[PDB]
Scaffold this active site. Sequence first.
Site, PDB file in Angstrom:
ATOM      1  N   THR B  33     -48.111 -28.481  96.880  1.00 25.18           N
ATOM      2  CA  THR B  33     -46.746 -28.985  96.732  1.00 25.18           C
ATOM      3  C   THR B  33     -45.840 -27.999  95.994  1.00 25.18           C
ATOM      4  O   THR B  33     -44.606 -28.081  96.113  1.00 25.18           O
ATOM      5  CB  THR B  33     -46.709 -30.313  95.919  1.00 25.18           C
ATOM      6  OG1 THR B  33     -47.259 -30.088  94.617  1.00 25.18           O
ATOM      7  CG2 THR B  33     -47.509 -31.456  96.603  1.00 25.18           C
ATOM      8  N   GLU B 100     -50.986 -33.032 101.374  1.00 21.06           N
ATOM      9  CA  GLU B 100     -50.385 -32.268 100.268  1.00 21.06           C
ATOM     10  C   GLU B 100     -51.216 -32.438  98.991  1.00 21.06           C
ATOM     11  O   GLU B 100     -51.518 -33.578  98.564  1.00 21.06           O
ATOM     12  CB  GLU B 100     -48.938 -32.714 100.007  1.00 21.06           C
ATOM     13  CG  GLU B 100     -47.926 -32.183 101.042  1.00 21.06           C
ATOM     14  CD  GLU B 100     -47.373 -30.790 100.707  1.00 21.06           C
ATOM     15  OE1 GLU B 100     -47.807 -30.157  99.725  1.00 21.06           O
ATOM     16  OE2 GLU B 100     -46.491 -30.299 101.435  1.00 21.06           O
ATOM     17  N   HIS B 147     -51.877 -24.239 105.689  1.00 21.91           N
ATOM     18  CA  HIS B 147     -50.518 -24.029 106.204  1.00 21.91           C
ATOM     19  C   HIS B 147     -50.258 -22.534 106.535  1.00 21.91           C
ATOM     20  O   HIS B 147     -49.633 -22.180 107.548  1.00 21.91           O
ATOM     21  CB  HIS B 147     -49.481 -24.560 105.207  1.00 21.91           C
ATOM     22  CG  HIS B 147     -48.129 -24.780 105.819  1.00 21.91           C
ATOM     23  ND1 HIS B 147     -47.059 -25.233 105.086  1.00 21.91           N
ATOM     24  CD2 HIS B 147     -47.667 -24.586 107.082  1.00 21.91           C
ATOM     25  CE1 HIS B 147     -46.004 -25.354 105.871  1.00 21.91           C
ATOM     26  NE2 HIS B 147     -46.332 -24.937 107.082  1.00 21.91           N
ATOM     27  N   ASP B 157     -49.829 -21.324 101.339  1.00 24.46           N
ATOM     28  CA  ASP B 157     -50.607 -22.489 100.874  1.00 24.46           C
ATOM     29  C   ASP B 157     -51.779 -22.854 101.782  1.00 24.46           C
ATOM     30  O   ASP B 157     -51.641 -22.730 103.001  1.00 24.46           O
ATOM     31  CB  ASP B 157     -49.704 -23.706 100.533  1.00 24.46           C
ATOM     32  CG  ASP B 157     -48.791 -24.168 101.693  1.00 24.46           C
ATOM     33  OD1 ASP B 157     -48.701 -25.404 101.907  1.00 24.46           O
ATOM     34  OD2 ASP B 157     -48.130 -23.348 102.363  1.00 24.46           O
TER      35      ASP B 157
HETATM   36 CL   LIG Z   1     -42.632 -25.675 106.831  1.00 22.42          CL
HETATM   37 CL   LIG Z   2     -45.311 -26.289 102.433  1.00 23.00          CL
HETATM   38 ZN   LIG Z   3     -47.434 -26.112 103.207  1.00 19.92          ZN
END
Ligand SMILES: [Cl-]
Ligand SMILES: [Cl-]
Ligand SMILES: [Zn+2]
Lengths: 257, 257
Positions: B33, B100, B147, B157
Site C-alpha cells: 500500500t 493489498e 504488481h 511492489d
Molecule cells: Cl496501477
Molecule cells: Cl500499487
Molecule cells: Zn501495486
Amino acid sequence: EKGIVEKEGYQLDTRRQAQAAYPRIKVLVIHYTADDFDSSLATLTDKQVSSHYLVPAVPPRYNGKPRIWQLVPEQELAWHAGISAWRGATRLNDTSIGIELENRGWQKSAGVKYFAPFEPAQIQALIPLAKDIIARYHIKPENVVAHADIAPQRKDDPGPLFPWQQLAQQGIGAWPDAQRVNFYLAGRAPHTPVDTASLLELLARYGYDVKPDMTPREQRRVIMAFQMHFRPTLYNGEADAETQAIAEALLEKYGQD
Amino acid sequence: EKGIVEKEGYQLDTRRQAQAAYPRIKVLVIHYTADDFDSSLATLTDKQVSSHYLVPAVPPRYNGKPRIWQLVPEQELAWHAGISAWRGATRLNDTSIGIELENRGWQKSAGVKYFAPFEPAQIQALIPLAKDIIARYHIKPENVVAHADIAPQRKDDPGPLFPWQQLAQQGIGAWPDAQRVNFYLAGRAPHTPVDTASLLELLARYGYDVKPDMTPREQRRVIMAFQMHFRPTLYNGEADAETQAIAEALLEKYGQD
Ligand SMILES: [Cl-]
Ligand SMILES: [Cl-]
Ligand SMILES: [Zn+2]
Ligand SMILES: [Cl-]
Ligand SMILES: [Cl-]
Ligand SMILES: [Zn+2]
C-alpha cells in the site's frame, strides 16, 4: 458479528465496501451455430468449444414461455470467441457472455454465399434474455457484438440477416441516429468512394481489430464485418460515403471506451 | 421441473452442462500500500482505486484468527492493476484478484532506495487466504504475481523483501528447482554477463511485457522486476548467468500458457 466472515486460519471483515467495483462481464457476443439443435448441443458441450446459451431456431414453449438452454454458469467463461479483439480488449472469452443461435449461417448457391433468415420466434425469445443480461452487468450498447465484429478475419456470424436495428429499437445494441448519418454523408451519394485508410481509422476507434500493414483482403474483411452489422444492404468490403457516415455517427453517439 | 429456471418472457433449461467452463479469475496480484492502514482503507474505497483484500501489517486477532478486510466481492473486478500485461493477457483487473499488503514499500536513505521488511504476522495471515483463493479458481503457481511483474515500467511492489520462496514452499506461487538452476548455469559464475536480448526473450516467454525497440532503461526495468521477485539479492537490472538460469529453470517447470 454482522459483516464478519469466519474462514479457516483467518476471518474477513466485509463492512467497508469499495466504490470502484465493476462486473468482469462487459461484452455480449451473438453467434450462429451453422448446425441443427442436437448437433449444436453436442458440439457446445464437448472439450473444445462452448457458449453460455443456446437458443433453438423456434424455441419450444412451456408455461407460455420459450425455452432456452443454458450450458455454462455466467460466472465462468465459455469457449466461444477464440482469438479476438474489441475496443482494446483481447481474449474476449474472459469478459463476455456468448449466445449461440441455432441458424444455418451461409450456404453457397450457384457460388453466391446466401445467408439463412432468423425466425421471429427465435428473435422474440432472444430479446428478454439479452435485456436481462444487459441489465445484470450494465453492458453498454456498443458492447453487444457480432462474433464477426471481434474476429473479422475469421468469422461472419450472425451475418447480414441478423436484425440488429430491430434489437436496437428494443434497447439491445448500438445503432446510429438517422439524422446524424445524413449529416456525415455531407452531400455525398451513399456509394461515393471514400479513402480506405480514413474508414479503417474510424473502425479501429469504434473497436475493430485494425493493424498497420494489413493486406487489401484483410482491409476488406474488417469493412465487410462492419457492413454486415451496420450496413447490411451492401457488405462488399469497399469503403464508401454511407459506410463512413455510419461509423462517424456511431462514434459520435457511443465513443471509444 | 428440476433444471428448469423460470424467467420473465422465457425459461432456462440448465440440464446439459458444457465441459468447457472455466474461471474468469486466473491471476492473483500482490501489492504493497505504501501507506498506513486507515489511509490505505480510505484510498482503496475511493473513486479511483480499490483491491479485493487489505491485510494489516500485524492483523488484529479475534476468535484466535487474524482479521483481513475484504473490500470488493471476488465476482467483481477491483481497480488495482492499471495498465498491465502478463503471459499474453492485458487489462489484468479483468481476470485477477488483487491483495493489498499494508507495508511502507521503499524509502530513500542517503539516496539508497531501502525497502520495508514484511512482518511474519502479515505473511502468516496471507498464507491461508492465498491458498483459499488459489484452490477456489485453480490458479496456476506462475500466475501468483507481483504488481511489478505485470507493470514492470511503473511498479516495484511488493518488492525485493517479499518472501516468495517461503510462500512457494507452502504451495503459493512459482519457484525454480535448485538443481535445474545449477544445470542452466552451465559452469558459469552466477554474475557472469549474459547477452541482454537472450535474457529478454526468456522473460517475454515467462510472461513479462517485452516489446521491440525498448530503450536501455526499459530493458533494465523488466530485468529488475524479474530479479526483485526471483533473484532478490541483486536486482540491478543487468543480465547475468544466474538470472538467465533462473528464467530457464522457471520456463522448464511452468511453461508459457
Ligand atoms: Cl496501477
Ligand atoms: Cl500499487
Ligand atoms: Zn501495486
Ligand atoms: Cl462461431
Ligand atoms: Cl472461435
Ligand atoms: Zn461465432
